[PDB]
Design a binder for these strands. Structure first.
Lengths: 95, 97
DNA sequence: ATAAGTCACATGGTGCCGAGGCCGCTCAATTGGTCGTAGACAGCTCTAGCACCGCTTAAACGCACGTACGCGCTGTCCCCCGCGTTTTAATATTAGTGTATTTGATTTCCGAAAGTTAAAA
DNA sequence: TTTAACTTTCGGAAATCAAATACACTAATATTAAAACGCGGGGGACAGCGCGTACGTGCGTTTAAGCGGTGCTAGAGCTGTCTACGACCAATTGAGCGGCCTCGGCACCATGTGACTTAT
């Protein structure tokens, strides 16, 4: 048997449709970008909860994630990342 | 209505939520944390694939390939710091001039 | 002439065949609601900071200057390889067997939870 | 006086047992892309050298670095107290694809009455 495997490939392809509607993706490229988000997710979350443990505070929260991303990303990308995280969570909380 | 739709995000905020639960990083998770993380991941993915698409334009073909991806990631000097440890599958290596 | 009768006509209705039109069951994850507890907080006090002077003379910077030192120099040695050649072993095809994984049904395993109390500066 | 280890339990985990694929390798095969032998070569990298040089090598007078008092206050760390916020439960949905049905339309046999007719 073979269990259903987690993937973000549909979302990756959709955002590529938004960017370049005429462009497709190779299978190897799609596996590569599917691995991108999981690798980033891990190296953000571990650092964020380690920072939370340094705070000796129970909850991993938005401030912890913001700090973790701005720690680990190179600064030029970090500015964009924190701005987009903040505006996204604000748009959500405005619901 | 879905959480991703309410956020305006394309990526699966609910999947990021449940994955944070699976990754046992902390017992109590703020509700804003998964959506913030999903937004960050979506931004990074969009940026890298846009760079790869422009690389494909430079190579004059309409499908992304690991060579396009490797060229983009190595050429962008900030994402090369972010993924300096990574080497891409069928990605190659950049020229001396 | 007319009650009986045959007859055809006319309409009844009963039966079977699709078929397009609603319907039934299930699982996603939402959101509705609700306990209980992390979180920010409420007076707070005192820490190690960080000035804020107020000395001293130990570094230190320049003043001199000097071998050391460099840096191309230069006969020449040498070695790498650009091929040209025979090899030469890298293809990349089938293959079934021989576990390798593997996914059901448990079936014990065991530590988080709930008392109860040992210990502990 | 506060950080543990007794315990007293139990209900998900982590064993087990099993068969269902299925994949690895151990292996024939002619080909055939690259290996590796084989001699010059350029080319270059090192020998040897002059003299310019550049960082130490060496003195004089500075400068900061280091103490050494003199505050004083900004946070450290701690709030004693009020929630909020999120972890749970479940309901509160839903949509998608099978199921019945049920529409109406055909082919077929039943039933009554209008001719008419005849033997009443």
């Amino acid at each position: 048997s073979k269990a259903r495997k987690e993937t973000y490939s549909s979302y990756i392809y959709k955002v590529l449709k938004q960017t370049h509607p005429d462009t497709g993706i190779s299978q190897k490229s799609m596996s590569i970008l599917n691995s991108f988000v999981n690798d980033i997710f891990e190296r953000i979350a571990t650092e964020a909860s380690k920072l939370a443990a340094y705070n000796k505070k129970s909850t991993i929260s938005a401030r912890e994630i913001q700090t973790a991303v701005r720690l680990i990303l190179p600064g030029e990308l970090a500015k964009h990342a924190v701005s987009e995280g903040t505006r996204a969570v604000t748009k959500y909380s405005s619901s | 209505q879905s959480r991703s739709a309410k956020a305006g995000l394309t990526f699966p905020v609910g999947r990021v939520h449940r994955l944070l639960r699976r990754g046992n990083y902390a017992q109590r998770i703020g509700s804003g944390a998964p959506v913030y993380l999903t937004a960050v991941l979506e931004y990074l993915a969009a940026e890298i694939l846009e760079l790869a698409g422009n690389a494909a334009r430079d190579n004059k073909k309409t499908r992304i390939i690991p060579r396009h991806l490797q060229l983009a990631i190595r050429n962008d000097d900030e994402l090369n710091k972010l993924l300096g440890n990574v080497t891409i599958a069928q990605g190659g290596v950049l020229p001396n001039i």
